[PDB]
């Protein structure tokens, strides 16, 4: 009975900020691997950005490095992503995806997902 739960989504206009959260209970949260993930109706789900168990350790997407900011509190076991600049091209569901050890970076090595929370950028 692991359970990732998302938040913090919802519309704003482009140049806004957003902060979604990723709440996590069952297994223990620090031996996994937190990834961000996004799909737009007909295209692949994109990574987005990935952390380490500790915390250390962050990657981005080229596209929103500097804009975007991943981090996690394993005492409260929930993994952040603030988004800022928003533009329309991050429109999208962004799905949080948990990896054992590893952090996954493509869709396939996620072993557990949350609901996904949808992000909308008007302009």
């Known amino acids: 009975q692991v359970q990732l739960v998302e938040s913090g989504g919802g519309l704003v206009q482009a140049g806004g900020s957003l902060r979604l959260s990723c709440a996590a209970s069952?297994?223990?949260?620090?031996?996994?691997?937190m990834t961000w993930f996004r799909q737009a109706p007909g295209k692949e789900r994109e990574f987005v950005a990935a952390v380490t168990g500790n915390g250390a350790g962050t990657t981005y997407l080229p596209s929103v490095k500097g804009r975007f900011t991943i981090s996690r509190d394993n005492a409260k076991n929930t993994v952040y992503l603030q988004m800022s600049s928003l533009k329309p091209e991050d429109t999208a569901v962004y799905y949080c995806?948990?990896?054992?050890?590893?952090?996954?970076?493509?869709?396939?090595?996620?072993?557990?997902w949350g609901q996904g929370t949808q992000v909308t950028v008007s302009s």
């Open positions: 069952g297994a223990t949260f620090i031996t996994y691997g």
């Open positions: 995806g948990g990896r054992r050890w590893v952090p996954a970076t493509a869709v396939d090595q996620v072993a557990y």
